[PDB]
Amino acid sequence: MFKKARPFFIICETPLHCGSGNDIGNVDLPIQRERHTDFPKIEASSLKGGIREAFEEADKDIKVGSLTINISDKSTISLAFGPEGALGFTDARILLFPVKSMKGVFAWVTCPQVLERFKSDLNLCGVNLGFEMPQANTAPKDCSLFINGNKIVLEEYTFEIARDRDESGNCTSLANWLSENLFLANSGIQFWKEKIKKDIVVISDDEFRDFVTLSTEVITRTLFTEEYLPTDTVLYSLALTTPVFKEKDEEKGIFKQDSANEEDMVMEFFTTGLPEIIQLGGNATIGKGIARVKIL
Amino acid sequence: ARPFFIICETPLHCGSGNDIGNVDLPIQRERHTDFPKIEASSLKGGIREAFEEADKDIKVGSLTINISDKSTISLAFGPAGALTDARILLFPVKSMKGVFAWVTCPQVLERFKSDLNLCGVNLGFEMPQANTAPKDCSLFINGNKIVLEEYTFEIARDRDESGNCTSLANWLSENLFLQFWKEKIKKDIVVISDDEFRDFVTLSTEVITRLFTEEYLPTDTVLYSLALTTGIFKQDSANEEDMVMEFFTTGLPEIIQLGGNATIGKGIARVKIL
Amino acid sequence: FKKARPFFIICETPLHCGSGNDIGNVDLPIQRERHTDFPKIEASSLKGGIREAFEEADKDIKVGSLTINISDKSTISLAFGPHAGALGFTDARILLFPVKSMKGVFAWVTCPQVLERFKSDLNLCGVNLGFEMPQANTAPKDCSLFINGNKIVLEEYTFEIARDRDESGNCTSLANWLSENLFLANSGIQFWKEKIKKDIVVISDDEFRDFVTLSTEVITRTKALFTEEYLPTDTVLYSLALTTPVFKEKDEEKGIFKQDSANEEDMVMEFFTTGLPEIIQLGGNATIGKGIARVKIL
Amino acid sequence: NNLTIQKSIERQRAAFAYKCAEAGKSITKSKEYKAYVKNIPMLIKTNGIGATFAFVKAKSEADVDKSGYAYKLIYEQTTEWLKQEPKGLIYEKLNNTDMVKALVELDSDKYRAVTNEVLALFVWLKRFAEGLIE
Amino acid sequence: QKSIERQRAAFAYKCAEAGKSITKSKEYKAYVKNIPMLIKTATFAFVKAKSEADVDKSGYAYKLIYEQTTEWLKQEPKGLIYEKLNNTDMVKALVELDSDKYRAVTNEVLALFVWLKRFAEGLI
Amino acid sequence: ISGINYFLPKDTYAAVKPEQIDNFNLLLNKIPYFDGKKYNASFIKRLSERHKNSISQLLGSGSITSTTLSPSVYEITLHHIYGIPYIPGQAVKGVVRSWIITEVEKKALKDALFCHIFGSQGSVIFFDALPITLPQLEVDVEFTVGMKEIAISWLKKALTE
Known part of the structure; x- marks a missing residue:
């Protein structure tokens, strides 16, 4: 149905709380989880609302193909995201999760199921990674989390993790690709880029679920208690587009080009004007939910 | 005919109208057993929407054309074509060991064996009896017990690969997928008793509250259907159904959109022909 | 979130912000970041403290071309909230931490991760420092904590650090920038003015984590004989103050914020940045004189 | 017909919870018991079951009129289950x-x-304790 | 067994059960709770110094803890x-x-x- | 080595000697002495000046009335960072309560004056004092800054007793 797709990551800068409504869960205000795996996610509705609000409040001028256009014009947006549509988004899933460590302070943990889902989702958009995913209990060659041999000590647990040699392994390539495609062209952010090259650990799908479920921030507000996603989480999602829903050429705005389809112009409008920071989730009045978005 | 098995990739929600119950936008259900299903008027509509949008060249019979031909689609399947209702075969449920486990009742397996026999397929092994699990299952804690959701079931593993459960798991792994999912499906397939199955499919469906509540089918669900057969491809004549079915099998794209809310990525599914 | 600015918090008396029982070593631990074990103040507590200190003050302020007393209840609801307010705040994170030193009385500490995060936060507010964050185990050019040539010892433990060579070094630039950002521009508490420009020490994150996990003052008490945990004196924090155009429909209800010259966000920012007291009281158990922190907007 | 195993367990959980709530309301410090029963799930979430119940054991008080009797009752009740x-x-x-x-x-x-x-x-x-005790 | 946090628990409980059946018992609890804070502000040397090997003296408590806090x-x-x-x-x-x-x-x-500290108060 | 110090384990023994420290919290507490069988004042003044100025600026001038009513380790309330001799903080409250309870429970809990003054919804606020005399004060063998009506009077009388 949809014609074009493009992956785009989401990186949290402060704790994020995409409310799940209500339930009989332990905490009073829980985050939204997949029913059959208990992995956190962000529903497409909240993400689309956030991106729409970020776009509408902006004020700039961009070149969509061959014509100048301000990004804040009501008519264009209404034609793009739909009437108060031609553009869409998919539910955001969790890719990397931070967990406390004895050495290095904090480490990122992912599991084979998440990586396989990521690879499958990257298939719809026509991007081929060029290497296989890593096996369970593996870490890059230059990992620094090791203490006294092969053992790693995350939280209160101790997993026996096998290093990788020869710099050609699957896990090292995964880490290098993430470092080289998860952050914009360098402008001064060197620390995170350097760290992500060495502090990734892949663990079994069972334990990764033991985390996440019992390793999320819990705060007491004034009484009722809330639950949040830790900072430095990494999520991914897709943007889907289709030709505009119209009948008359003069009613399509700038998206009806002389020699270009509507879908490509819509995609150029989206990717060439998306802001650099957006606000997601609830409780935004107290600085919770800011996030960074990169397309690649 | 040809059994083509649909598998979900994102939560799938087909509009069932309205209700005065708890959920304010339920999903279509079988009128007398509450099993979920997809209406043919939506499946065929979505497949046609995929065909009318695709663009490629295939070879059917003798000649060769592009599936975008308005005439070809207009005639082959619908403006009335030589070419049923969707059924649920597996369902995911949370487990303490293994993250998730697929569960299916003996009744659904009997319906499946009935449905396939029209196409000529002969599985050759008796369907597994209720309360059984494959030989290499990874859902067992303390040996004789599994814990789905927050409850405990008692199940007996098949001692040898000859049994029914292992054979069914192997056949499902081989036929269903053209690597991780194939490796898993051969190990995690439980068969609960029929009565307990209805509870899961009625009180274990995702309900995202955006104030009102919607309802979607969980991801990684497995459904199956039947496609039967009977100008540009006129040829000397339609040899039995070999023409229409050939066109259908050749033209079926790999990703299709079903149900509503498609503007927010819901309703994507994978189509494979048995 | 049209506009935002940063503002520092300096503690002068023990500051405590409890968080549940959280059964542990100390019977009343302070709030701690989950995935790094650093201390922090939840945004709700900071917001409540600043609102309280805003309510009970009294003084005239000027916003563009009008005058209003900051204690009025007609504007507080619009600014802070009873309609979500138009002036939020971000949680407070730890930037510098004082640990006992043998030479120099007391030496501050910090780690590269904290400084990198701080630099990232200032980028949202259109502020660029103009130099590079220093690397681990680096101290200013003219430090006075040294003993035995190049060694330094804070607490029982011992550390090896290397000094700079000239003014262009990263540590000297960082110290010089902090000096004219963390204290008053004019005369004030200058007894610490030159100690922050000479006694900052940068250590690898692994050591800083342990320092902050074990170098918290623990002043016992009776009531029923339990313990307590406090953030040492002279701790330095930071946070971001956010703003947005007011949430009103009719142009009459916008209050003093709506003029005929500039936008609403600028007026809200002027209100906040000219209507704050240079001293405040956060935390808890204030009746025993615990917790007095200065506040300085950048 | 016989009940599905998915419900034969809930029908036991509810009954046992109600019995425990009544037994708690019987004692002389019902308010303390009601307050205490609302904190354990959060403690389990934040620390873990073992540490939570070790702490619960720590505060147990022998006498039945002391404010800590609720913790002893909670220990015994969660031991029975x-x-x-x-x-x-x-x-x-x-x-x-x-x-x-x-x-x-x-x-x-x-x-x-x-x-x-x-x-x-x-x-x-906790659902029944919130109700039967005011 | 494979979790550090749960490993210390097994040793702690058996450690405390060794406190009971000793003549001087209530003393033991007093130093157990007094140990942590001391270490905050060598500390074992203090514990080593005040040891006495008799099984009916108020110093036996340090004769246990020292040997007990080294086996771990x-x-x-x-x-x-x-x-x-x-x-x-x-x-x-x-x-x-x-x-x-x-x-x-x-x-x-x-x-x-x-x-x-927790198990000491549980059974002592 | 061992014996006198029992600390500075090789890394920390060098580059430090028993008579080169500059912070009494460490010397008194950090390095004990085992027998085998059992300060510049400019800071002392600036600390008090800053403490007073801060309590002043935050507090109303009218509300508080200062009232001067006062001048290793083995088996010494030193300020954790500064390591000076005056960090009572709460002992002012404790001494006042002990003096009045001993001098003056149901009877103690019958007069409103014993519901806010020694409140227990606190209203009266007591601050930890500090040095005022730069004394060496070696051991041999504003002390009250209450603020928030008439309370330093009750406190002075209690202290004298």
Whole structure:
């Protein structure tokens, strides 16, 4: 149905709380989880609302193909995201999760199921990674989390993790690709880029679920208690587009080009004007939910 | 005919109208057993929407054309074509060991064996009896017990690969997928008793509250259907159904959109022909 | 979130912000970041403290071309909230931490991760420092904590650090920038003015984590004989103050914020940045004189 | 017809929770018991079952009129449930040892099953305690 | 068994059960709770000094804790000091390490007593 | 080595000697002495000046009335960072309560004056004092800054007793 797709990551800068409504869960205000795996996610509705609000409040001028256009014009947006549509988004899933460590302070943990889902989702958009995913209990060659041999000590647990040699392994390539495609062209952010090259650990799908479920921030507000996603989480999602829903050429705005389809112009409008920071989730009045978005 | 098995990739929600119950936008259900299903008027509509949008060249019979031909689609399947209702075969449920486990009742397996026999397929092994699990299952804690959701079931593993459960798991792994999912499906397939199955499919469906509540089918669900057969491809004549079915099998794209809310990525599914 | 600015918090008396029982070593631990074990103040507590200190003050302020007393209840609801307010705040994170030193009385500490995060936060507010964050185990050019040539010892433990060579070094630039950002521009508490420009020490994150996990003052008490945990004196924090155009429909209800010259966000920012007291009281158990922190907007 | 196993367990959880709530309301410090029953799930979430119940054991007070009697009652009640609810996962140990001692000699899977069991019991225990005591 | 946090629990409980059946018992609880804070502001040397080997004296409590709080360090999961403790005494080893190892052991010892404090009040 | 110090484990023994420290908290507490069988004042003044100025600026001038009513380790309330001799903080409250309870429970809990003054919804606020005399004050063998009506009077009388 949809014609074009493009992956785009989401990186949290402060704790994020995409409310799940209500339930009989332990905490009073829980985050939204997949029913059959208990992995956190962000529903497409909240993400689309956030991106729409970020776009509408902006004020700039961009070149969509061959014509100048301000990004804040009501008519264009209404034609793009739909009437108060031609553009869409998919539910955001969790890719990397931070967990406390004895050495290095904090480490990122992912599991084979998440990586396989990521690879499958990257298939719809026509991007081929060029290497296989890593096996369970593996870490890059230059990992620094090791203490006294092969053992790693995350939280209160101790997993026996096998290093990788020869710099050609699957896990090292995964880490290098993430470092080289998860952050914009360098402008001064060197620390995170350097760290992500060495502090990734892949663990079994069972334990990764033991985390996440019992390793999320819990705060007491004034009484009722809330639950949040830790900072430095990494999520991914897709943007889907289709030709505009119209009948008359003069009613399509700038998206009806002389020699270009509507879908490509819509995609150029989206990717060439998306802001650099957006606000997601609830409780935004107290600085919770800011996030960074990169397309690649 | 040809059994083509649909598998979900994102939560799938087909509009069932309205209700005065708890959920304010339920999903279509079988009128007398509450099993979920997809209406043919939506499946065929979505497949046609995929065909009318695709663009490629295939070879059917003798000649060769592009599936975008308005005439070809207009005639082959619908403006009335030589070419049923969707059924649920597996369902995911949370487990303490293994993250998730697929569960299916003996009744659904009997319906499946009935449905396939029209196409000529002969599985050759008796369907597994209720309360059984494959030989290499990874859902067992303390040996004789599994814990789905927050409850405990008692199940007996098949001692040898000859049994029914292992054979069914192997056949499902081989036929269903053209690597991780194939490796898993051969190990995690439980068969609960029929009565307990209805509870899961009625009180274990995702309900995202955006104030009102919607309802979607969980991801990684497995459904199956039947496609039967009977100008540009006129040829000397339609040899039995070999023409229409050939066109259908050749033209079926790999990703299709079903149900509503498609503007927010819901309703994507994978189509494979048995 | 049209506009935002940063503002520092300096503690002068023990500051405590409890968080549940959280059964542990100390019977009343302070709030701690989950995935790094650093201390922090939840945004709700900071917001409540600043609102309280805003309510009970009294003084005239000027916003563009009008005058209003900051204690009025007609504007507080619009600014802070009873309609979500138009002036939020971000949680407070730890930037510098004082640990006992043998030479120099007391030496501050910090780690590269904290400084990198701080630099990232200032980028949202259109502020660029103009130099590079220093690397681990680096101290200013003219430090006075040294003993035995190049060694330094804070607490029982011992550390090896290397000094700079000239003014262009990263540590000297960082110290010089902090000096004219963390204290008053004019005369004030200058007894610490030159100690922050000479006694900052940068250590690898692994050591800083342990320092902050074990170098918290623990002043016992009776009531029923339990313990307590406090953030040492002279701790330095930071946070971001956010703003947005007011949430009103009719142009009459916008209050003093709506003029005929500039936008609403600028007026809200002027209100906040000219209507704050240079001293405040956060935390808890204030009746025993615990917790007095200065506040300085950048 | 017979009831599905998915409900024969809920119909037991609710009954046991109600009985525990009434037994708690009987004692002289019902307010303290009601307050205490609302904190354990959060403590389990934040720390873990073993540490939570060790702490609960710590505050136990012998006399029945002391403010801490509620913790002793909670210890005993949550000890009774684990004998029956898991269907024989940890029964063999509780017969001759204190519950906390048993709860530290288990593997990960049994630990997570016990955690889920206790949370499921408490979702009903606190639900009835909020009601029967004002 | 494979979790560090649950490993200290098994040793702590058996440790406290060794406190009972001793003539001077209520004393034992007093020093158990008094140990943590002391380490905050060498500390074992104090404990070593005040030891007396009799089984009916108010110093036996340090005759247990010292031997009890060294057996744990032999079974340490991270394994900070195993060989050096095989042919020496705790104070005779912790005075033979460097700055880095001191912090590692410092946290480890203060960690065990947390469970010892809880279990000490449970049964004592 | 061992014996006198029992600390500075090789890394920390060098580059430090028993008579080169500059902070009494460490010397008194950090390095004990085992027998085998059992300060510049400019800072002392600036600390008090800053404490007073801060309590002043935050507090109303009218509300508080200062009232001068006062001048290793083995088996010494030193400020954790500064390591000076005056960090009572709460002992002012404790001494006042002990003096009045001993001098003056149901009877103690019958007069409103014993519901806010020694409140227990606190209203009266007591601050930890500090040095005022730069004294060496070696051991041999504004002390009250209450603020928030008439309370330093009750406190002075209690202290004298």
